[PDB]
Amino acid sequence: GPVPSRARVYTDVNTHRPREYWDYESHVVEWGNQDDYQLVRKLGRGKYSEVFEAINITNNEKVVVKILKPVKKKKIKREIKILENLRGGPNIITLADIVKDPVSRTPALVFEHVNNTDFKQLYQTLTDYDIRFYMYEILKALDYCHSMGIMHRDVKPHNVMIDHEHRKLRLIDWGLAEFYHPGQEYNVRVASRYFKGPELLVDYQMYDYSLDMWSLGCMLASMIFRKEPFFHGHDNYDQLVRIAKVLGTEDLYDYIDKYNIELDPRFNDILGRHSRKRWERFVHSENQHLVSPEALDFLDKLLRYDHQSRLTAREAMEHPYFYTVVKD
Ligand SMILES: Cc1c2c(c(C)c3c1[nH]c1ccc(O)cc13)C(=O)N=CC2
């Protein structure tokens, strides 16, 4: 059937790690004291959790409480194990506690609070300098988790929490994250539509860390071009069409041919024939101050159909685009 694929970096990180590192099913949760925390206000709801601002009454620190509710139960232990594995890594949200909520009777994850600037407001506002700075900060998080054998699989603006005042950034919501095992087939139903990689959209299951690099590319494109989202599909099929209208259909066919992937025949009537566009197409008087040759070359190396051809997180940090950024 399909041609197999392996990550070109950190391929065997988990194979050379003890069972207990990646065997999240066997992880035993360590419970804290739910009475330490007092819920203050509801911040949001997702498909698998309700999120509250709270106070840790033992130290008076503001905190965030994520009360879980998933239908697949092993997912709870997956997120917990991932968070524990990545704790203290650069720009990774810190899991501060795990408590049993008395009302839901489910695990509640307690994180450090981030005084956040809304991305709707914060994008279309960032300077060229600030875009490069924050991209480098996100890359620190991704190289860290990739190096630890973990793919995020839901990189998007909402999951990048920015305290713009202290110029602080954290990658959050590791509930879709998975351990990368070479040759493993994964669920293509991950990530949010506008940020789904071509691999997901063509049903290619043997994907890897490089999925997050496509998502990051979608974020970068939306920032430098001031078009939110950059690839604006009406559904998952139209999502691939929107991509092909930019990257072209010939490189798409080359990609699926390389892996002996067959497109859903549904595309016969909607995909059409599209040339690759030059990135200057998307530059105009209102975004030109955010665009540079370095920015375009960097973006070009992220937004590639072939997941194997994308810059890795580590390579991306090497890019000329980041030369202007002061290295702490
Ligand atoms: C999953 C999730 C959501 C929200 C927030 C603030 C957080 C969140 N995880 C977090 C982790 C730390 C934090 O400071 C805030 C959030 C949120 O505001 N709305 C939906 C989901």
Side-chain angles (χ1 to χ4, degrees):
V3 167
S5 178
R6 300 277 183 285
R8 300 203 311 194
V9 294
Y10 311 124
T11 314
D12 309 314
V13 156
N14 290 314
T15 95
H16 299 293
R17 222 135 188 159
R19 166 87 52 177
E20 61 269 18
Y21 180 83
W22 51 260
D23 183 20
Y24 62 85
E25 282 160 55
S26 299
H27 175 73
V28 179
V29 178
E30 211 167 14
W31 301 96
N33 274 224
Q34 70 80 26
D35 44 287
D36 285 352
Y37 309 101
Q38 177 182 119
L39 300 187
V40 174
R41 65 181 172 104
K42 197 165 66 193
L43 294 173
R45 173 184 274 166
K47 29 228 149 181
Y48 328 108
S49 62
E50 277 201 326
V51 181
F52 295 83
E53 181 186 354
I55 191 92
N56 183 336
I57 213 86
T58 213
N59 58 21
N60 256 62
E61 299 287 322
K62 291 184 194 290
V63 82
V64 166
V65 181
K66 183 184 181 169
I67 302 176
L68 313 175
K69 68 191 191 194
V71 281
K72 300 170 198 167
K73 266 82 179 175
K74 67 163 63 60
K75 200 166 147 188
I76 290 160
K77 278 194 185 186
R78 191 178 67 189
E79 186 178 352
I80 286 170
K81 186 66 192 200
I82 287 167
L83 284 164
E84 282 176 12
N85 287 348
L86 300 176
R87 188 149 53 203
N91 300 329
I92 307 298
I93 198 70
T94 301
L95 181 65
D97 219 339
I98 308 158
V99 304
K100 190 87 91 295
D101 186 68
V103 178
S104 67
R105 258 149 47 258
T106 68
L109 308 183
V110 184
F111 308 98
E112 73 189 308
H113 175 267
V114 169
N115 173 32
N116 187 57
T117 327
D118 169 50
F119 91 81
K120 187 78 72 274
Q121 282 182 120
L122 200 59
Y123 292 35
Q124 323 282 131
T125 297
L126 290 178
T127 60
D128 176 38
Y129 189 78
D130 280 0
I131 296 167
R132 315 189 189 206
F133 180 87
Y134 286 128
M135 281 291 299
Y136 196 82
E137 296 298 307
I138 303 170
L139 286 167
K140 286 178 186 169
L142 290 174
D143 185 52
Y144 190 72
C145 71
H146 297 348
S147 77
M148 306 273 304
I150 289 155
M151 46 191 174
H152 189 281
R153 306 197 302 177
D154 200 17
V155 175
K156 60 177 178 183
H158 177 264
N159 290 340
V160 180
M161 281 283 163
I162 298 166
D163 182 5
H164 193 47
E165 196 187 326
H166 304 87
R167 304 183 66 75
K168 202 167 89 184
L169 180 153
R170 299 284 179 277
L171 181 56
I172 69 155
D173 202 353
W174 296 82
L176 286 196
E178 255 296 14
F179 290 89
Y180 174 71
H181 294 109
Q184 186 160 141
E185 294 192 322
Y186 293 94
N187 179 11
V188 301
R189 289 285 183 267
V190 295
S192 304
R193 187 193 305 149
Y194 308 133
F195 303 93
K196 287 171 186 286
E199 55 271 51
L200 307 182
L201 300 176
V202 301
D203 253 51
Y204 187 75
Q205 285 181 282
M206 284 181 69
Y207 62 81
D208 63 66
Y209 316 110
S210 59
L211 172 68
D212 295 328
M213 298 313 293
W214 177 274
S215 300
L216 186 71
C218 294
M219 289 184 55
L220 181 65
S222 73
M223 295 179 300
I224 70 174
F225 297 131
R226 303 227 138 123
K227 186 181 177 303
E228 152 211 32
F230 189 71
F231 297 121
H232 203 154
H234 308 150
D235 54 45
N236 290 344
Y237 309 109
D238 187 55
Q239 189 66 28
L240 187 59
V241 184
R242 294 308 189 184
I243 296 172
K245 282 184 175 157
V246 172
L247 276 81
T249 45
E250 299 204 312
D251 291 338
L252 174 55
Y253 284 117
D254 279 357
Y255 172 49
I256 65 171
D257 288 352
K258 171 176 173 181
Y259 299 93
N260 296 12
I261 302 165
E262 204 195 324
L263 270 191
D264 187 336
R266 180 195 323 243
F267 286 108
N268 294 155
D269 288 329
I270 64 166
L271 186 55
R273 222 137 56 118
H274 307 282
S275 67
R276 182 108 184 178
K277 306 313 175 297
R278 305 202 183 263
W279 296 107
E280 283 76 29
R281 175 79 161 247
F282 309 101
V283 179
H284 51 65
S285 55
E286 289 67 65
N287 65 20
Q288 68 183 239
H289 60 113
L290 303 177
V291 189
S292 63
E294 292 77 11
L296 295 180
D297 183 69
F298 177 47
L299 181 66
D300 187 72
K301 294 176 190 329
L302 299 176
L303 294 182
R304 286 150 131 69
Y305 288 112
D306 191 353
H307 53 277
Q308 280 178 25
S309 302
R310 296 174 204 148
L311 291 171
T312 63
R314 187 61 101 113
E315 295 180 300
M317 295 170 74
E318 301 290 289
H319 199 274
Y321 185 59
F322 300 115
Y323 293 170
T324 199
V325 175
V326 168
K327 306 284 139 35
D328 279 58

